């Protein structure tokens, strides 16, 4: 009988989003809380049924308010006194499945070392903006850190060149990761 970790992270900050709550089972995100909608959102459809139970609303409320209290009351007092912890976001891009020209695939943009948790991800195809599939998932990970996943559905072609642009929100820093078609698997 091996152990497994259920991580429930309530975090808040000076900036947007001002507050968040991420939950994970070992390395994977289970839910994220939408405070504007008062509800847990499932990372995957199959977790939809479990995202309904709200037996811990008061605990979430307690933690939320205490968190916002530290940023609001404490913080302005530490402002200038201690150096603000900050980490440059590191982005990497890769296909969800092995490359096969003309076949539907999905590009993944994984962002790590994100701190504070404020970002925007933009996808481009040959220097041309293109909207991604679904939202960008920001989650908390062990060690008071954050990461994010973004996806782009596409059908790879020999001349393709894509890029994932990560903005550590409000122009703190901008990272860019490029993806080029290589070692494509032979088609039938």
């Amino acid at each position: 009988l091996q152990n497994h970790t259920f991580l429930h992270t309530v975090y808040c900050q000076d900036g947007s989003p001002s507050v968040g709550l991420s939950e994970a089972y070992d390395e994977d995100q289970l839910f994220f809380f939408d405070f504007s909608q008062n509800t847990r959102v499932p990372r995957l459809p199959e977790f939809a049924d479990w995202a309904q139970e709200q037996g811990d609303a008061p605990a979430i409320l307690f933690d939320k308010e205490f968190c916002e209290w530290m940023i609001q009351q404490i913080g302005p007092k530490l402002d200038g006194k201690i150096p603000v912890s900050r980490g440059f976001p590191i982005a990497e891009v890769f296909t969800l499945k092995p490359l096969e020209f003309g076949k539907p695939n999905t590009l993944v943009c994984f962002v790590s070392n994100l701190f504070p948790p404020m970002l925007t991800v933009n996808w481009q195809h040959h220097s041309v903006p293109v909207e991604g599939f679904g939202p960008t998932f920001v989650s908390a990970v062990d060690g008071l850190s954050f990461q994010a996943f973004s996806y782009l559905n596409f059908t790879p072609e020999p001349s393709d060149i894509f890029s994932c642009i990560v903005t550590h929100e409000i122009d703190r820093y901008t990272a860019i990761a490029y993806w080029v078609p290589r070692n494509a698997l032979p088609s039938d």
Binding site: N3, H4, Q13, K97, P116, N183
Partner: protein
């Protein structure tokens, strides 16, 4: 600044609560956590933010609802994860696997094979190579590290540098708890 109010629960495959933590952090500095053998929040930081750690511990320790809540942390962990835990600790997804040639690197060999393994869960996976039915590269790391896709699936790849001979058949053997039997993918120079 960024602040944290993080809870963690350690449970086994059965849903039995083994551990539980509740810690407050500020500016990515762990300041104070719940101390069961004391029934209160106790400082963890003894550096510059030590006084803040004591101030936060104080304010929280005066919250009866929180004290009663943390005293029952272990039970809360089991009760809360109860509806889905079993479905997670039992969750598995079999890996898809394909072999093909790839541009050689860090080698003198003329050919390099890539065994692609993806769509699997959990992340633990073992890959070995067989030449005409016999194991090769014994001193390699069969226990591979995998890249998470963020959607509860993982992927990894193993390489094999070689010189082709038309009669040789190379087989990528993949083992994963999500698959009852080993998964094999063959490759030959004339394919």
């Amino acid at each position: 600044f960024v602040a944290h109010v993080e809870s963690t629960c350690l449970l086994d495959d059965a849903g039995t609560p083994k551990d539980f933590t509740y810690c407050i952090s500020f500016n990515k500095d762990l300041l104070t956590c719940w101390d069961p053998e004391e029934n209160k929040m106790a400082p963890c930081e003894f550096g510059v933010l030590n006084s803040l750690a004591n101030v936060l511990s104080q304010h929280l320790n005066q919250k009866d609802t929180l004290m009663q809540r943390l005293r029952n942390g272990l039970q809360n962990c089991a009760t809360h994860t109860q509806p889905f835990w079993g479905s997670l600790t039992n969750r598995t997804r079999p890996p898809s696997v394909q072999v093909a040639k790839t541009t050689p690197f860090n080698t003198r060999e003329p050919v390099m094979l890539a065994c692609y393994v993806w769509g699997f869960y959990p992340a633990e996976v073992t890959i070995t190579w067989r030449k005409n039915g016999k194991l090769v590269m014994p001193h390699s790391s069969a226990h591979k590290t995998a890249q998470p896709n963020g959607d509860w699936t993982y992927q990894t790849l193993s390489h094999l540098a070689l010189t082709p001979s038309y009669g040789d058949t190379y087989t990528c053997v993949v083992e994963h708890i999500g698959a009852p039997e080993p998964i094999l993918r063959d490759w030959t120079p004339g394919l």
